Amino acid sequence: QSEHNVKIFHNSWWTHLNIKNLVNNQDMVFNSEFINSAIIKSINNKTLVENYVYSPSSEKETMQLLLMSSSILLHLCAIISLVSI
Amino acid sequence: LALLTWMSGRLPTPATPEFWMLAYFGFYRKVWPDAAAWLQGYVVPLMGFA
């Protein structure tokens, strides 16, 4: 069995390149936003059911508000914890 | 208990509502079932009961 060595020269030549703008056929002349539609659709379609408040009418509004609040607070907490160093 | 003591500067004495929140939502809601099972199978017979 052979003993390996740490490669220290030109290790990943494909990493320090921005091939994205060439591969996606930009500058010569895919679309997102199915994501948030699917997320809010799943929130509505499941909604966890507030049977403790005997399944109130709003419900989906509460779950969407909780999702937006959690996302905003997670981003802000990440930024504050990063700058706390 | 340790994290609340460090964050607030006050140990959760039984006169403090944080102790009662940690007693209900903590001990009672989470570890009391396990404690109950272990107790009814070790101490309650050792007390002669059941």
Binding site: - | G41, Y42, P45, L46, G48
Partner: protein, 500 residues
């Protein structure tokens, strides 16, 4: 020199033969060479490799469709015990069903203290009985009666103690601890001596037919030809009265009494054979010279018996006690060893049987459970539902059909043709069809009486069976499939559960 005229000559030319399938006879020397000097095939044998045959009558190979993943093959990764599907346990013999569970406690676990933290277990006790022999003995006498009355009678307890070698009661003691060898030997010697001191002169069977398995057909047995004789019962009774004629009810066994278990003889002989337990299992002090060493039944040093190893004590008739053993763990790595086999020690078999299922046993729960289960193979059912009988007393097989709920609809109910079995019993149609079946059977009984030592009587019975089958068949074609079903249920709900 070293028996040059005796160890040679191929030991009496190896005039003992076998019998494989189509009557082919092979010599024991040939078969011993096949298991000894043919180890290439044994390399495949201890590898469970799958090969699959080819079709010999096919022009193009075509590997033959087989399902070989049998219970023993699939179970090789399991631990402790194998697992089959009931039919595979019905095959491969496997007729020793479990009748009781138990334990040999060092300190008995109390429900007080800390849940039972003083519960040291030395052994786990299981009892097994031959279910066909349990049926044939305890079923033709103690069958079809009230089981509570049967187990309440002290005669049933005496009979299951006496007929223990006949049932072949094997007790498996599985070690639940790393037990020291000297402690276990001393405990078993003391317990069996205590039970030998109370073994009064009691009852043993006597042989009604000798021989069987002559040294040309060692593969074969005599019992199917004995039970499928041209007269059977008559011949058996004739043999019986020419020796020991059955005095009891429909069980067989002549039961000589008292003296059969001599006192200064076999009881004292067994009290010496027990003294040659701690000088045959733990001999002179060298834990590498003690017979049970090196094998997985003990540890590396041989001092202690490993947890999970089991000791199998089988009580054969004529006082034969067979002590085998089996290592624990993965069954694919388990190795079974024959430890000893004593013959003619009627005190040892009786003493072990009393120690396990006596008035004071080693486990009263095991004795009660065994004597209570035994009525289930006595009533022709086996302990485990191997035959998948729906009417089993315990673990019954289910029909696999969803139960029906009557809907509150009209379109589901259809008035089709004559495609419903009769389910209302006692009605005028059922009574009149029972009357027509009755006159058909009466015609069959009348026609079977005109069909004109015990072999000629059985031939006459066969001729009457043929005539009755003809007349009954003609009458059943005169009647309907509902009458066929009624004859089937009448035949089913008329025979004893023992099958007599």
């Amino acid at each position: 020199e070293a028996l040059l005229a005796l160890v040679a000559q191929r030991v009496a030319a190896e005039r003992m033969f076998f019998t494989l399938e189509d009557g082919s006879k092979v010599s024991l020397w040939d078969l011993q060479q096949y298991v000894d000097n043919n180890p290439e095939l044994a390399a495949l044998a201890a590898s469970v490799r799958r090969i699959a045959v080819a079709d010999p009558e096919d022009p193009a190979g075509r590997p033959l469709p087989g399902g070989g993943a049998s219970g023993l093959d699939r179970s090789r990764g399991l631990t402790g015990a194998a697992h089959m599907s009931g039919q595979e346990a019905e095959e491969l013999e496997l007729d020793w069903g479990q009748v009781g569970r138990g334990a040999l406690w060092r300190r008995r676990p109390t429900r007080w203290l800390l849940g039972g933290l003083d519960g040291v277990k030395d052994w786990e006790l299981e009892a097994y009985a031959h279910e066909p022999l349990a049926n044939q003995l305890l079923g033709a006498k103690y069958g079809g009666r009230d089981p509570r009355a049967v187990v309440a009678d002290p005669a049933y307890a005496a009979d299951v103690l006496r007929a223990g070698p006949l049932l072949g009661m094997t007790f498996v003691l599985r070690a639940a601890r790393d037990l020291p060898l000297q402690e276990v030997a001393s405990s078993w010697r003391g317990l069996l001596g205590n039970y030998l001191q109370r073994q009064a002169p009691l009852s043993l069977p006597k042989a009604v037919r000798p021989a069987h398995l002559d040294p040309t057909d060692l593969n074969g047995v005599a019992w199917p030809a004995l039970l499928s004789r041209p007269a059977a019962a008559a011949h058996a009774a004739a043999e019986a009265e020419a020796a020991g004629a059955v005095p009891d009810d429909e069980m067989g066994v002549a039961w000589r009494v008292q003296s059969g278990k001599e006192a200064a003889a076999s009881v004292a002989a067994a009290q010496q054979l027990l003294q040659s337990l701690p000088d045959a299992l733990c001999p002179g002090p060298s834990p590498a010279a003690w017979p049970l060493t090196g094998t997985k039944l003990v540890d590396e040093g041989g001092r202690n018996w490993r947890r999970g190893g089991s000791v199998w004590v089988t009580l054969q008739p004529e006082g034969g006690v067979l002590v085998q053993a089996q290592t624990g763990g993965v069954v694919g790595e388990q190795e079974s060893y024959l430890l000893t086999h004593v013959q003619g020690q009627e005190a040892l078999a009786g003493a072990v049987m009393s120690a396990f299922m006596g008035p004071q046993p080693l486990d009263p729960e095991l004795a009660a459970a065994a004597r209570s289960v035994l009525l289930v193979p006595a009533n022709g059912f086996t302990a485990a539902n191997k035959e998948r009988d729906p009417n089993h007393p315990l673990y019954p097989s289910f029909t696999g059909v969803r139960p029906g709920r009557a809907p509150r609809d009209v379109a589901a109910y259809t008035l089709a043709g004559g495609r419903t079995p009769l389910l209302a019993a006692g009605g005028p149609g059922e009574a009149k069809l029972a009357s027509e079946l009755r006159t058909v059977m009466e015609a069959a009984l009348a026609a079977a009486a005109r069909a004109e030592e015990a072999e000629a009587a059985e031939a006459r019975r066969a001729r009457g069976r043929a005539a009755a089958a003809a007349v009954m068949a003609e009458g059943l074609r005169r009647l309907g499939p509902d009458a066929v079903a009624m004859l089937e249920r009448t035949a089913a709900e008329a025979e004893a559960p023992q099958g007599g």
